[PDB]
Amino acid sequence: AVPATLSWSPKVAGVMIACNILAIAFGKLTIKQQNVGTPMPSSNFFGGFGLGAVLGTASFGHILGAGVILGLANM
Amino acid sequence: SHSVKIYDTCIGCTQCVRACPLDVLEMVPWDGCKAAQIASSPRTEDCVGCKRCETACPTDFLSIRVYLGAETTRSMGLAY
């Protein structure tokens, strides 16, 4: 009775990509300092983010995607 | 209360006076030492007997001694 996980499928990619987008949207409204440290080459496409902010929100996106995918695969 | 006695070997170094936390000791002019001052104990009714004055005396043995006698509220250091 091991919990059931999913083999890689386009649905998994879409789900966690939605998670990434929502994580970025949430991070833009919550991070106190968003333009400190090493910056992007062209911040216009990143909404005034530095490298740290982009990496943090992307890591948060992968984390939320992993959690959501595993939870959905369980049920 | 306790009895604080000062003998004639005092040299007027004031260490006993400064070490007293309850302000029992004092300095009064004298003529037996270079400093021309000797310690005095005019307020022995406030002394508790912590022996800091004896601890601070630099002379051989002590020019100041504290003999613990009748215990009062002030001597016993009671705040209640």
């Binding site: - | 302000d23 005019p42 043995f61």
Partner: protein, 139 residues
């Protein structure tokens, strides 16, 4: 009478007790040049008012410890603090300094008390004064 605004303090459980209202208490007054913070001898820290400050304590040792702290722990040295004893009947007895001059320095006019005219090795033997109500140092 005693005049002064109490320092800004939140209070504590280490303050006075029934002895102050039944036996006696003590008071200390001092003029602070500027408002600052000082350690309560009963615990904690209290902000003292600019100008004249008045404070009640339970023992003379606590008042003198506070006075030493005032004299030694602030760059503008506080030298004008006065310590009185407050009786329940309302009588105020002025204690420290005795004559306006600190006891650490010699001042003309004081009378020598408790001074013996002999070395400590010249005290009489107990057997010579036994059955009397005295002690070798007392004679």
């Amino acid at each position: 009478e005693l005049s002064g605004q109490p320092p800004k303090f939140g209070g504590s459980t280490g303050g006075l007790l029934s002895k102050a209202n039944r036996e006696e208490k003590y008071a200390i007054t001092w003029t602070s040049a500027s408002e600052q913070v000082f350690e309560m001898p009963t615990g904690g820290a209290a902000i003292m008012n600019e100008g004249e400050n008045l404070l009640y304590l339970a023992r003379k040792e606590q008042c003198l410890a506070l006075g030493t702290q005032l004299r030694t722990k602030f760059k503008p040295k506080i030298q004008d603090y006065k310590i009185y004893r407050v009786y329940p009947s309302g009588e105020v007895q002025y204690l420290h300094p005795a004559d306006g001059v600190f006891p650490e320095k010699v001042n003309e006019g004081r009378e020598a008390q408790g001074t013996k005219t002999r070395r400590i090795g010249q005290n009489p033997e107990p057997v010579t004064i036994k059955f009397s109500g005295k002690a070798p140092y007392e004679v």
